[PDB]
């Protein structure tokens, strides 16, 4: 049940930090 | 291994070498006196708050009691 919850209950902008985190994460796979 | 590490702070000492002329009891007493400052419980009681002393006593008790002190566990499973 825990693993099922973790899988289904995954994670869910005008913040600079978020934008930068997106660019570096994209430069990665 | 944990028990071996905790000997200095629990007044536990090894069998010291004894030579002719010197008695084992006197040597052991002198060695214990030399290591007296390392002892925690008595030191804490001498210079400690009531709460600190209680906590120290509990910690010492937990530290000295372990399953390796003569407790078996496979017999229950069998």
């Amino acid at each position: 049940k825990g693993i099922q919850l973790r899988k289904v209950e995954e994670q869910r902008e005008n913040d600079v930090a978020t934008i930068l985190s997106r660019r570096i994460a994209v430069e990665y796979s | 291994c944990d028990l071996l590490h905790a000997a200095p702070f629990q007044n536990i000492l090894p069998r010291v070498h004894v030579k002719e002329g010197e008695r084992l009891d006197a040597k052991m007493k002198r060695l214990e006196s030399k290591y007296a400052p390392l002892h925690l419980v008595p030191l804490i009681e001498r210079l400690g708050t009531p709460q600190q002393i209680a906590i120290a006593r509990e910690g010492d008790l937990l530290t000295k009691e372990r399953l390796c002190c003569g407790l078996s566990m496979f017999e229950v499973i069998l």
Partner: protein, 78 residues
């Protein structure tokens, strides 16, 4: 020591998917990650005293107690 069976009779484990992340969140760098993977690659194909002691250290007492209880339940069922 424990070594894997010549023919597996179980493959329904269906483990999760390895999450990818930057080298910094890992050992620190590509070279460091590769070096650590090579270092730890010798223990992949066997289980021995090192694994048992690591498991004991990580599980304290609660993990061992619960694991043995579940093992007893499994043995009773079988």
């Amino acid at each position: 020591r424990f070594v894997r069976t010549v023919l597996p009779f179980s493959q329904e484990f269906q483990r999760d998917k390895q999450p990818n992340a930057q080298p910094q969140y890992l050992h620190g760098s590509k070279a460091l990650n590769l070096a650590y993977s090579s270092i730890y690659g010798s223990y992949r194909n066997f289980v021995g005293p090192p694994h048992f002691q690591v498991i004991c250290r990580l599980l304290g007492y609660q993990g061992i107690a619960v694991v043995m209880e579940e093992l007893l339940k499994v043995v009773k069922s079988l």
